[PDB]
Subunit: 308 residues, 2 copies
Amino acid sequence: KAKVLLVVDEPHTDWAKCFRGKKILGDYDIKVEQAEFSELNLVAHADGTYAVDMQVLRNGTKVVRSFRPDFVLIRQHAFGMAENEDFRHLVIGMQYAGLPSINSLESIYNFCDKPWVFAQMVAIFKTLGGEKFPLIEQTYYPNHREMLTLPTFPVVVKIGHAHSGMGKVKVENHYDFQDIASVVALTQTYATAEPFIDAKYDIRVQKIGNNYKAYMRTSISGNWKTNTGSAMLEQIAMSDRYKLWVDACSEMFGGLDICAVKAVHGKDGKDYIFEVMDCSMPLIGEHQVEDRQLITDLVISKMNQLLS
Amino acid sequence: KAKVLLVVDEPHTDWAKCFRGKKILGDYDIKVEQAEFSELNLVAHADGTYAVDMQVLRNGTKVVRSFRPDFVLIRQHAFGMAENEDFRHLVIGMQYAGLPSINSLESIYNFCDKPWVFAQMVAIFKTLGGEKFPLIEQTYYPNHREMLTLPTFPVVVKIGHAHSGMGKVKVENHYDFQDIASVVALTQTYATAEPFIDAKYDIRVQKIGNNYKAYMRTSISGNWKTNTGSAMLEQIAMSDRYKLWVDACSEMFGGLDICAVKAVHGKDGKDYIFEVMDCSMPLIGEHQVEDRQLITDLVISKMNQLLS
């Protein structure tokens, strides 16, 4: 028979293809169920039983089906403040069911608040020092009332929690900072402000299991945004410097199997680490195929370790 | 020479009295700043600097003092859905600042969602088995749509996340269950349902550092009306059975310095563990002054361990 693997990812990636013919536990096959978070639901019980509901719109028809996954690979962001982007209830349900997964449900749950993740990077920065781990300066404001404490301009202000550049604004002077603070008051959430780096290059160091890759590219908008995919991220040599950055970040929340550190190299000759991404990190460059391959092997390795 | 201890607790408990005359690191005095979450704010920086602001109502009706705590003791619930009960942003800010505390900020943060905490007890249940850890049967519904499948009545349905039992309702037939399911829909949150236990008595096993106490409250209220006043409560002898329950629960989220497990003993002569409380647990019984003294020693021990 087979072990069921639930993969939460968009339809543009066909994970069933990646796991074809692949066996675990010696003789078991893997049946892949794939869906986006918006199409999933579940119920879980303290006694160990649970069932996942999937309503998939396929080739012209509202499809329904139920199943009991044995493992889960999560490739989609589970949070976000925009409309219909909050799936924390599903992450809690999977942990309640005791589902093993990549990344671990513990880590995914803790990646919900970006400044909470950044707090783990600040502790690493204190342990290793800036020479080895150049964390960007950043200020955390619990709400709008503390934004009377001004940062040095220009800064990039990031409001609440959200991906794909959502909620990030570049602020160049006090007057516009005051206006942004009044907007943070409306949203009733927290915000962060970090210096806007006049950047030379963007850098991403990724770790998938035991595989590492570093990519760099000319930076057009630094740590503010990525503007209209002008330059593709190109792989460069892995250095011992870069490896330490991602190995150190990968230890948080019990360990991240898939993660990436983003940094900018400024025209001032310095590196500034400003973000860590987990298993929902998009795949980039000419190696998506190969990276999906590495993720597939990682998943098989884990199902063999944890399942029975 | 003094270290500042921020204690987040209501005004009736005068923690400054518990710490008067106590020293840390040999010759430093302890300066206690006490306030409730609603009167506090802060700003934190990745470079390590941070500051807390407390709204005072002494000579000015709207006083405002600032300080830099070295350690924090949290005795108030930091979450909750009622009017101005949500302080997750301050918890995040204290962790961003790297503030040591009791209980740990990591554990406090993870106690925000009751079913997430319960998910840890389900894992303990699988490990130890029911003879040793009699976890109550419970079902987790990520949202109202999974509540179509009806449970066996009567049940206690817990809606969303709030303490003091807020949001708990006893449901006896599917008509009322359907109305509660519509309230869950209205609140856009999750819910849990567990059998309503016809109870002989209540049991609470607490652990403060390495001190343990077991208390029994007799009533039929069972797992429906909890936390409420104790017009009738009494201590009892600890047993290896009870100690294992709280010790196993105290290991979650990196370790809980202060916690308690609640259970009801059924008229059927069986125990049902249904809740774990962390450092915001109310102090009960006649030994409340002894308990505060135990919490005070724990805080001094920890400050000596983590400060310089």
